[PDB]
Design an enzyme around this catalytic site. Structure first.
Site, PDB file in Angstrom:
ATOM      1  N   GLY A  18       0.783  -1.237   0.000  1.00 48.92           N
ATOM      2  CA  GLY A  18       0.000   0.000   0.000  1.00 48.92           C
ATOM      3  C   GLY A  18       0.811   1.281   0.000  1.00 48.92           C
ATOM      4  O   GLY A  18       1.843   1.366   0.663  1.00 48.92           O
ATOM      5  N   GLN A  19       0.333   2.280  -0.742  1.00 49.59           N
ATOM      6  CA  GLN A  19       1.001   3.579  -0.846  1.00 49.59           C
ATOM      7  C   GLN A  19       0.513   4.554   0.216  1.00 49.59           C
ATOM      8  O   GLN A  19      -0.646   4.511   0.622  1.00 49.59           O
ATOM      9  CB  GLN A  19       0.799   4.182  -2.250  1.00 49.59           C
ATOM     10  CG  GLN A  19       0.994   5.718  -2.344  1.00 49.59           C
ATOM     11  CD  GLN A  19       1.405   6.213  -3.730  1.00 49.59           C
ATOM     12  OE1 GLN A  19       1.683   5.421  -4.634  1.00 49.59           O
ATOM     13  NE2 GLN A  19       1.451   7.533  -3.896  1.00 49.59           N
ATOM     14  N   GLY A  20       1.423   5.418   0.660  1.00 50.55           N
ATOM     15  CA  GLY A  20       1.098   6.604   1.461  1.00 50.55           C
ATOM     16  C   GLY A  20       1.696   7.845   0.810  1.00 50.55           C
ATOM     17  O   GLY A  20       2.387   7.745  -0.209  1.00 50.55           O
ATOM     18  N   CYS A  21       1.451   9.016   1.395  1.00 52.76           N
ATOM     19  CA  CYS A  21       1.923  10.279   0.808  1.00 52.76           C
ATOM     20  C   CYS A  21       3.450  10.474   0.873  1.00 52.76           C
ATOM     21  O   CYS A  21       3.996  11.399   0.257  1.00 52.76           O
ATOM     22  CB  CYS A  21       1.198  11.476   1.440  1.00 52.76           C
ATOM     23  SG  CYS A  21       1.493  13.057   0.585  1.00 52.76           S
ATOM     24  N   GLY A  23       5.710   7.463   0.950  1.00 55.72           N
ATOM     25  CA  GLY A  23       6.378   6.255   0.480  1.00 55.72           C
ATOM     26  C   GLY A  23       5.478   5.038   0.452  1.00 55.72           C
ATOM     27  O   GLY A  23       4.276   5.131   0.709  1.00 55.72           O
ATOM     28  N   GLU A  24       6.070   3.889   0.144  1.00 55.50           N
ATOM     29  CA  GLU A  24       5.319   2.648   0.011  1.00 55.50           C
ATOM     30  C   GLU A  24       5.638   1.643   1.125  1.00 55.50           C
ATOM     31  O   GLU A  24       6.560   1.850   1.916  1.00 55.50           O
ATOM     32  CB  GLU A  24       5.546   2.054  -1.380  1.00 55.50           C
ATOM     33  CG  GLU A  24       4.877   2.875  -2.479  1.00 55.50           C
ATOM     34  CD  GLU A  24       5.675   2.924  -3.766  1.00 55.50           C
ATOM     35  OE1 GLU A  24       6.115   4.033  -4.146  1.00 55.50           O
ATOM     36  OE2 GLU A  24       5.860   1.858  -4.396  1.00 55.50           O
ATOM     37  N   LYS A  39       9.251  -0.320   4.766  1.00 55.04           N
ATOM     38  CA  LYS A  39       8.665   0.993   4.532  1.00 55.04           C
ATOM     39  C   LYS A  39       9.641   1.850   3.719  1.00 55.04           C
ATOM     40  O   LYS A  39      10.849   1.824   3.959  1.00 55.04           O
ATOM     41  CB  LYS A  39       8.325   1.655   5.871  1.00 55.04           C
ATOM     42  CG  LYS A  39       7.366   2.838   5.793  1.00 55.04           C
ATOM     43  CD  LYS A  39       6.977   3.317   7.184  1.00 55.04           C
ATOM     44  CE  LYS A  39       5.949   4.434   7.119  1.00 55.04           C
ATOM     45  NZ  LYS A  39       5.328   4.681   8.453  1.00 55.04           N
ATOM     46  N   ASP A 130      -2.461   7.576  19.347  1.00 55.70           N
ATOM     47  CA  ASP A 130      -3.347   7.083  18.290  1.00 55.70           C
ATOM     48  C   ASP A 130      -3.601   5.568  18.312  1.00 55.70           C
ATOM     49  O   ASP A 130      -3.553   4.897  17.285  1.00 55.70           O
ATOM     50  CB  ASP A 130      -2.852   7.540  16.914  1.00 55.70           C
ATOM     51  CG  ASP A 130      -3.914   7.402  15.842  1.00 55.70           C
ATOM     52  OD1 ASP A 130      -5.122   7.419  16.179  1.00 55.70           O
ATOM     53  OD2 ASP A 130      -3.541   7.268  14.661  1.00 55.70           O
TER      54      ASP A 130
HETATM   55  C1  LIG Z   1      -6.381  -0.973   4.937  1.00 54.55           C
HETATM   56  N1  LIG Z   1      -6.149  -2.354   4.453  1.00 54.55           N
HETATM   57  C2  LIG Z   1      -7.293  -2.802   3.629  1.00 54.55           C
HETATM   58  C3  LIG Z   1      -4.880  -2.490   3.691  1.00 54.55           C
HETATM   59  C4  LIG Z   1      -3.683  -2.734   4.635  1.00 54.55           C
HETATM   60  C5  LIG Z   1      -2.362  -2.958   3.880  1.00 54.55           C
HETATM   61  C6  LIG Z   1      -1.532  -4.025   4.595  1.00 54.55           C
HETATM   62  O1  LIG Z   1      -1.855  -5.210   4.500  1.00 54.55           O
HETATM   63  N2  LIG Z   1      -0.481  -3.559   5.289  1.00 54.55           N
HETATM   64  C7  LIG Z   1       0.345  -4.306   6.045  1.00 54.55           C
HETATM   65  C8  LIG Z   1       0.202  -5.694   6.155  1.00 54.55           C
HETATM   66  C9  LIG Z   1       1.057  -6.442   6.962  1.00 54.55           C
HETATM   67  C10 LIG Z   1       2.063  -5.796   7.679  1.00 54.55           C
HETATM   68  N3  LIG Z   1       2.899  -6.504   8.465  1.00 54.55           N
HETATM   69  C11 LIG Z   1       3.858  -5.892   9.154  1.00 54.55           C
HETATM   70  N4  LIG Z   1       4.032  -4.574   9.094  1.00 54.55           N
HETATM   71  C12 LIG Z   1       3.230  -3.796   8.341  1.00 54.55           C
HETATM   72  N5  LIG Z   1       3.409  -2.472   8.258  1.00 54.55           N
HETATM   73  C13 LIG Z   1       3.870  -1.619   9.178  1.00 54.55           C
HETATM   74  C14 LIG Z   1       4.689  -1.977  10.248  1.00 54.55           C
HETATM   75  C15 LIG Z   1       5.122  -1.003  11.159  1.00 54.55           C
HETATM   76  C16 LIG Z   1       4.744   0.338  11.013  1.00 54.55           C
HETATM   77  N6  LIG Z   1       5.136   1.318  11.851  1.00 54.55           N
HETATM   78  C17 LIG Z   1       5.063   1.342  13.191  1.00 54.55           C
HETATM   79  O2  LIG Z   1       4.625   0.409  13.866  1.00 54.55           O
HETATM   80  N7  LIG Z   1       5.524   2.475  13.723  1.00 54.55           N
HETATM   81  C18 LIG Z   1       5.602   2.784  15.017  1.00 54.55           C
HETATM   82  C19 LIG Z   1       5.453   1.960  16.044  1.00 54.55           C
HETATM   83  C20 LIG Z   1       5.630   2.737  17.111  1.00 54.55           C
HETATM   84  C21 LIG Z   1       5.541   2.291  18.577  1.00 54.55           C
HETATM   85  C22 LIG Z   1       5.649   0.772  18.637  1.00 54.55           C
HETATM   86  C23 LIG Z   1       4.209   2.792  19.140  1.00 54.55           C
HETATM   87  C24 LIG Z   1       6.663   2.887  19.403  1.00 54.55           C
HETATM   88  N8  LIG Z   1       5.873   3.984  16.726  1.00 54.55           N
HETATM   89  N9  LIG Z   1       5.871   4.001  15.494  1.00 54.55           N
HETATM   90  C25 LIG Z   1       6.071   5.120  14.790  1.00 54.55           C
HETATM   91  C26 LIG Z   1       6.885   6.135  15.301  1.00 54.55           C
HETATM   92  C27 LIG Z   1       7.075   7.311  14.574  1.00 54.55           C
HETATM   93  C28 LIG Z   1       6.446   7.482  13.339  1.00 54.55           C
HETATM   94  C29 LIG Z   1       5.622   6.477  12.827  1.00 54.55           C
HETATM   95  N10 LIG Z   1       5.017   6.625  11.645  1.00 54.55           N
HETATM   96  C30 LIG Z   1       5.429   5.306  13.561  1.00 54.55           C
HETATM   97  C31 LIG Z   1       3.943   0.685   9.929  1.00 54.55           C
HETATM   98  C32 LIG Z   1       3.512  -0.284   9.028  1.00 54.55           C
HETATM   99  C33 LIG Z   1       2.214  -4.407   7.592  1.00 54.55           C
HETATM  100  C34 LIG Z   1       1.350  -3.666   6.775  1.00 54.55           C
END
Ligand SMILES: CN(C)CCCC(=O)Nc1ccc2ncnc(Nc3ccc(NC(=O)Nc4cc(C(C)(C)C)nn4-c4cccc(N)c4)cc3)c2c1
Length: 260
Positions: A18-21, A23-24, A39, A130
């Site tokens: 999936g895409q975001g604003c 990156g992917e 990511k 959040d």
């Molecule tokens: C809508 N449907 C229909 C379609 C769905 C599409 C789909 O299937 N996706 C998919 C499937 C399987 C996935 N499997 C694994 N990871 C994915 N992805 C994945 C993993 C990790 C993260 N990031 C974090 O967790 N960040 C995080 C954690 C924390 C804690 C822990 C609170 C300190 N802080 N931050 C943080 C801190 C600062 C900035 C930001 N941005 C964040 C983002 C994405 C996946 C994704």
């Protein structure tokens, strides 16, 4: 560069997710051995030092009920690699094929796991800001870990929503909302209510009714999470134990029904 750093050629980007604003998000392979999640940074859409603050946090916060960071790549094109959660996102999981099959025991067990991770965050004096079904990842055997995908007012405590008082007690509030999501199998909270109505009504005193087939004891825990005074809200530590011990201590009389 630190001991997290890796070489790009050690990676293998297979299927898109999936895409975001900025990156992917790609499924893939680390060292030809490991199911992985990657990511991306879309170059010059954000400061390379802010995109990698996501990683700074994931290093400080390591716990079995939190998403584990694996490795970074710091020279553009940039990457952040974390473990691969099979069932994907908890919201999609609940309003999908496995939905109708889940019952209270499975649902409570998931809640307990989340509370446990959030309990760890409580220890660290970190604030999530959040928490909700959409930011939970689901793995094998119904493991649930706290994540963040990067205005959610229906999920936000009013002191936060209104005055920017963000706290673990404002997170506790969202947990209670999360519980309704779990009990209604991925529903939106406050059905039939537009974003302004929520604010208006909540402050006046409105709270969500006990969902169909939900033990009054559980709904009670929700109301404790929605207490007006931030300090009258329970700790994630308390909630964890409550949920773990639920069917021995609180509802040993539980009879499974049509939906829960
Ligand atoms: C809508 N449907 C229909 C379609 C769905 C599409 C789909 O299937 N996706 C998919 C499937 C399987 C996935 N499997 C694994 N990871 C994915 N992805 C994945 C993993 C990790 C993260 N990031 C974090 O967790 N960040 C995080 C954690 C924390 C804690 C822990 C609170 C300190 N802080 N931050 C943080 C801190 C600062 C900035 C930001 N941005 C964040 C983002 C994405 C996946 C994704």
């Amino acid at each position: 560069k630190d001991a997290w750093e890796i070489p790009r050629e050690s990676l293998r980007l297979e299927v898109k997710l999936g895409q975001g604003c900025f990156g992917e998000v790609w499924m893939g392979t680390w060292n030809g051995t490991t199911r992985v999640a990657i990511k991306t940074l879309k170059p010059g859409t954000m400061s390379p030092e802010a995109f990698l603050q996501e990683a700074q946090v994931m290093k400080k916060l390591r716990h079995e009920k939190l998403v584990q960071l694996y490795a970074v790549v710091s020279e553009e094109p940039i990457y952040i690699v974390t473990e691969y959660m099979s069932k994907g996102c908890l919201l999609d999981f609940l309003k999908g094929e496995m939905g109708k099959y889940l019952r209270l025991p499975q649902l409570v067990d998931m809640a307990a796991q989340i509370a446990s991770g959030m309990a760890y965050v409580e220890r660290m004096n970190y604030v999530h800001r959040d928490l909700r079904a959409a930011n939970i990842l689901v793995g094998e055997n119904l493991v649930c870990k706290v994540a963040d995908f990067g205005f959610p007012i229906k999920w936000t405590a009013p002191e936060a929503a209104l005055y920017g008082r963000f706290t673990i007690k404002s997170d506790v509030w969202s947990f209670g909302i999360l519980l309704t999501e779990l009990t209604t199998k991925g529903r939106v909270p406050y059905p039939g209510m537009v974003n302004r109505e929520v604010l208006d009504q909540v402050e006046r005193g409105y709270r969500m009714p006990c969902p169909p087939e939900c033990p009054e004891s559980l709904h009670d825990l929700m109301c404790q999470c929605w207490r007006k005074d931030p300090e009258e809200r329970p700790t994630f530590e308390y909630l964890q134990a409550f949920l773990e011990d639920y069917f021995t201590s609180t509802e040993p009389q539980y009879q499974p029904g049509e939906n829960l």
